[PDB]
Enzyme design. Structure first.
Site, PDB file in Angstrom:
ATOM      1  N   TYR A   1      72.916 -71.692 -85.173  1.00  0.00           N
ATOM      2  CA  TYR A   1      71.370 -71.532 -84.658  1.00  0.00           C
ATOM      3  C   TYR A   1      70.739 -70.305 -85.069  1.00  0.00           C
ATOM      4  CZ  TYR A   1      72.392 -75.427 -82.027  1.00  0.00           C
ATOM      5  OH  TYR A   1      72.855 -76.890 -81.772  1.00  0.00           O
TER       6      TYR A   1
ATOM      7  N   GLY B   1      69.371 -69.143 -87.867  1.00  0.00           N
ATOM      8  CA  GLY B   1      68.660 -69.042 -89.011  1.00  0.00           C
ATOM      9  C   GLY B   1      68.757 -70.763 -89.403  1.00  0.00           C
TER      10      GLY B   1
ATOM     11  N   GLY C   1      70.126 -74.449 -90.312  1.00  0.00           N
ATOM     12  CA  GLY C   1      71.241 -75.603 -89.661  1.00  0.00           C
ATOM     13  C   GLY C   1      70.378 -76.005 -88.431  1.00  0.00           C
TER      14      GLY C   1
ATOM     15  N   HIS D   1      66.995 -69.180 -77.985  1.00  0.00           N
ATOM     16  CA  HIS D   1      65.804 -68.507 -78.795  1.00  0.00           C
ATOM     17  C   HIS D   1      64.895 -69.743 -79.284  1.00  0.00           C
ATOM     18  CE1 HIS D   1      63.256 -66.145 -81.463  1.00  0.00           C
ATOM     19  NE2 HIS D   1      63.029 -65.667 -80.354  1.00  0.00           N
ATOM     20  N   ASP D   2      65.642 -70.641 -79.680  1.00  0.00           N
ATOM     21  CA  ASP D   2      64.986 -71.852 -80.276  1.00  0.00           C
ATOM     22  C   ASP D   2      64.623 -72.820 -79.446  1.00  0.00           C
ATOM     23  OD1 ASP D   2      66.080 -71.010 -82.728  1.00  0.00           O
ATOM     24  OD2 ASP D   2      67.226 -72.390 -83.522  1.00  0.00           O
TER      25      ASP D   2
ATOM     26  N   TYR E   1      61.277 -71.534 -78.142  1.00  0.00           N
ATOM     27  CA  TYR E   1      60.074 -71.705 -78.996  1.00  0.00           C
ATOM     28  C   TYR E   1      59.351 -72.989 -79.262  1.00  0.00           C
ATOM     29  CZ  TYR E   1      60.025 -67.176 -81.521  1.00  0.00           C
ATOM     30  OH  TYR E   1      59.658 -65.573 -81.811  1.00  0.00           O
TER      31      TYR E   1
ATOM     32  N   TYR F   1      51.641 -60.539 -80.520  1.00  0.00           N
ATOM     33  CA  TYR F   1      51.666 -60.291 -78.773  1.00  0.00           C
ATOM     34  C   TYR F   1      51.697 -58.833 -78.794  1.00  0.00           C
ATOM     35  CZ  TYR F   1      56.669 -60.724 -80.112  1.00  0.00           C
ATOM     36  OH  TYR F   1      57.791 -60.423 -80.785  1.00  0.00           O
TER      37      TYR F   1
ATOM     38  N   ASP G   1      61.364 -63.709 -77.510  1.00  0.00           N
ATOM     39  CA  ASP G   1      61.708 -62.709 -78.313  1.00  0.00           C
ATOM     40  C   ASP G   1      62.648 -61.551 -77.540  1.00  0.00           C
ATOM     41  OD1 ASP G   1      60.812 -64.039 -80.356  1.00  0.00           O
ATOM     42  OD2 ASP G   1      59.371 -62.681 -81.060  1.00  0.00           O
TER      43      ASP G   1
END
Ligand SMILES: [Ca+2]
Ligand SMILES: [Ca+2]
Lengths: 119, 119
Positions: free
Chosen positions: A27, A29, A31, A47-48, A51, A67, A93
């Site tokens: 995850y 990057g 894939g 994190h994915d 988002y 931000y 983040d």
């Protein structure tokens, strides 16, 4: 934006190039699917998800939204200036940046064969 | 949506899983930076740009926008039942799946070292 997220990492995990996380596990990057190989890969998966939720607000584009954050001592902080989107993408983040600092790093899980390990 | 783009690749390069494009070159697969290693990678850079435009449309999430297409004995077609977003996205994927079918697959460009070759 990612230039900022790259700074939060540089701040909480100073001993590692940001690239170390750009191609780690299933995850962090490339894939984006399958079972997290380890405690660190799970940080990126969260994190994915983070988002996608933030991508729900019209116009809110996580990779391109700037931000207000401050990195002092290893302690990150999203300031109360950011708007709805900015405030959400930032918190994403921040929590990932910390996570990265507390999850073990396995070289063996860097640049792995996505096709044979993330199905 | 992401899943449909896998079937388009399946429709034009039936001898190859979509995982062979998941992480190839500096562009095929998430993110992307640097100079395209070859023709196939250049197809993916273009595809990224395309997605980048499709996102200017309000609330258009390429990766999720389910569109209306048809794969007939090798021929991909985006029907007209799609909205400006779906319509765009479908075209980004179609032209990409044809671009891969045209380019040659360099096994030594699959899962390269991003850091070393893409800054
Ligand atoms: Ca890789
Ligand atoms: Ca890409």
């Amino acid at each position: 934006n990612t230039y900022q997220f790259k700074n939060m990492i540089q701040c909480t995990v100073p001993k590692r190039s940001w690239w170390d996380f750009a191609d780690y596990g299933c995850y962090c990057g490339r894939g984006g699917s399958g079972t997290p190989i380890d405690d660190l890969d799970r940080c990126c998966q969260v994190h994915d998800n983070c988002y996608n939720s933030a991508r729900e607000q019209g116009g809110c584009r996580p990779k391109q939204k700037t931000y207000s954050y401050e990195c002092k001592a290893g302690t990150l902080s999203c300031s109360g200036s950011n708007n709805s989107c900015a405030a959400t993408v930032c918190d994403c983040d921040r929590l990932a940046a910390i996570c990265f600092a507390g999850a073990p790093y396995n070289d063996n899980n860097y640049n792995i064969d996505l096709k044979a390990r993330c199905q | 949506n992401r899943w449909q783009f896998k079937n388009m690749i399946s429709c034009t390069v039936p001898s190859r899983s979509w995982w062979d494009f998941a992480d190839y070159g500096c562009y095929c697969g998430r993110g992307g930076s640097g100079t395209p290693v070859d023709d196939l990678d250049r197809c993916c850079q273009v595809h990224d740009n395309c997605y980048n435009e499709a996102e200017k449309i309000s609330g258009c999430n390429p990766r999720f926008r389910t569109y209306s297409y048809e794969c007939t004995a090798g021929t991909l077609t985006c029907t007209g039942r799609n909205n400006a977003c779906a319509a765009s996205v479908c075209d980004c994927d179609r032209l990409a799946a044809i671009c891969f079918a045209g380019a040659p697959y360099n096994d030594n460009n699959y899962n390269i070292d991003l850091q070393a070759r893409c800054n």
